[PDB]
Amino acid sequence: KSCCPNTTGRDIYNTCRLGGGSRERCASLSGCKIISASTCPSDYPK
Amino acid sequence: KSCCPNTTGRDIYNTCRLGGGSRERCASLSGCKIISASTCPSDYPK
């Protein structure tokens, strides 16, 4: 599960994904984290 | 040089660069232009 610090991070991640990027690369490019739970924590809520 | 349309575009571009993205990749995510000269156009001043 990707979890992002804010909406802009989410938008970067999503855009990177839409273009074909891998999850871990897109997380790095966006500031998002890949976690093992399906619900995001309140500090990476987006 | 990266030339960005607005400060959000700058923030996105720089986040992507901080995550190891190439200039071209980060330009695509941000809407910024990569210009190989020092003066940005007025419409991409950030």
Side-chain angles (χ1 to χ4, degrees), chain A, chain B residues 1-23 25-46:
Chain A
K1 178 83 179 72
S2 56
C3 296
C4 296
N6 61 52
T7 291
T8 302
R10 171 56 61 196
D11 293 341
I12 302 169
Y13 179 88
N14 189 247
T15 300
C16 178
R17 290 288 294 156
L18 286 168
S22 73
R23 291 180 163 89
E24 290 283 353
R25 187 93 287 275
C26 296
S28 292
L29 296 180
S30 58
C32 302
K33 305 309 152 168
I34 307 300
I35 70 164
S36 69
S38 53
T39 60
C40 288
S42 68
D43 53 336
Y44 293 82
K46 302 306 192 179
Chain B
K1 191 174 185 48
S2 57
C3 297
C4 295
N6 47 53
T7 64
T8 294
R10 171 54 58 195
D11 295 347
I12 293 162
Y13 180 86
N14 284 9
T15 297
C16 172
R17 295 287 283 147
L18 285 166
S22 67
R23 294 187 305 167
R25 189 171 191 171
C26 299
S28 173
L29 291 170
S30 62
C32 309
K33 293 184 179 297
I34 306 307
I35 69 167
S36 49
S38 62
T39 305
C40 294
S42 62
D43 48 345
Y44 289 80
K46 304 307 183 164

